[PDB]
């Protein structure tokens with residue numbers, strides 16, 4: 001008699017987001033409001049009078065139960081919550097018990113409560129069921145329902161699920177990862193920021209979670225580098241361009257719109273000084289086209305070494321963040337070092353005696369980022385006192401390896417790979433390494449060279465002589 005008390009499907013647990021969309025066995029963003037709806041079908045006619053009508057729902061871990069939201073959605077019940085066992089119980093009021101017992105010869109439609117909370121963890125599966133016991137004589141156990149948040153691989157319901165890991169790598173223009181490498185003055189860091197969106201494929205988040213926006217933050221070292229605002233570009237993982245991503249630079253977080261600071265503090269992101277904020281313009285179109293389709297974006301964010309910072313040297317760090325649906329995830333930190341270049345000069349007298357200016361070049365340290373395209377010696381002598389004979393010899397100052405594999409020994413004459421020229425107007429000798437020899441050198445080998453400029457005194461007295469070394473068209477004085 002009691003197995004036919006509730007009607008056709010009897011009971012049915014449903015799980016929805018805040019737009020009322022069935023999200024069972026699908027994927028939803030972290031912090032999403034998730035409604036457990038404990039539907040119960042009409043009571044058959046010819047029943048006994050209903051003493052009790054009790055639904056008990058043990059809630060899953062990671063689901064933060066909201067008491068006043070679930071009470072408002074469960075009129076006709078009285079809501080009790082056991083915090084120690086994550087269990088919520090709904091007991092039908094005597095007023096809807098009365099409407100269940102108004103005429104037992106007709107079917108009556110029964111009320112149902114709704115649990116309202118939000119999921120709190122990434123890469124978690126949330127399971128739920130509930131039991132309904134009536135008149136402590138029957139009792140029915142419901143079907144299990146599932147929702148999953150992105151962040152865990154090998155999810156059987158979503159085969160694209162994985163770790164939400166935004167990545168940042170430093171590249172030159174050839175695409176070589178230069179993480180941790182040395183970077184010479186005037187060079188540019190072609191930073192690659194990945195906007196990790198693969199795992200969000202199949203997401204059914206609400207329309208207001210999407211309205212929290214989609215952003216990318218880059219905490220760039222403002223004290224060492226300058227942004228190249230016209231070379232920032234957002235592309236998908238293949239190469240096609242992305243228009244719908246705007247970029248704004250802020251010199252400090254405290255000098256930024258209060259919306260932006262609220263954004264970062266609700267994602268637990270804090271920035272050292274200046275940062276960039278990539279925005280989605282219209283988040284809804286950005287969602288349908290990149291988030292819901294699981295197509296990650298790539299942001300090339302090139303920045304160049306300041307002039308002064310190349311002369312002082314030091315180290316700098318870049319770090320980025322990804323902010324989807326309001327939730328923040330952080331890249332690892334990429335580190336680079338700028339070497340301080342300081343060439344020196346000695347001499348090696350008496351009227352018309354020949355002598356050499358020894359011009360030692362700057363040390364290009366091991367494990368550098370960019371190809372050498374310029375290593376030149378520039379000597380501005382006093383033509384009224386000394387004159388340049390026209391002979392000179394350039395030697396490596398250390399052991400040079402390169403791409404073929406050979407190692408050029410320390411002290412080897414490299415003058416058959418140089419090119420001099422003379423400016424008689426100002427009195428300037430310029431010994432240059434050509435490009436095709438410099439661009440034959442491995443990026444992991446060091447580089448240093450010296451030239452001996454043969455000169456002779458043609459006047460009495462002492463005379464000043466300035467020497468300037470050049471590496472990739474940045475000029476270093478000397479002492």
Ligand SMILES: [Ca+2]
Nearest residue numbers: 219220272274
């Ligand atoms: Ca910064």
Ligand SMILES: [Ca+2]
Nearest residue numbers: 381383426427
């Ligand atoms: Ca001169």
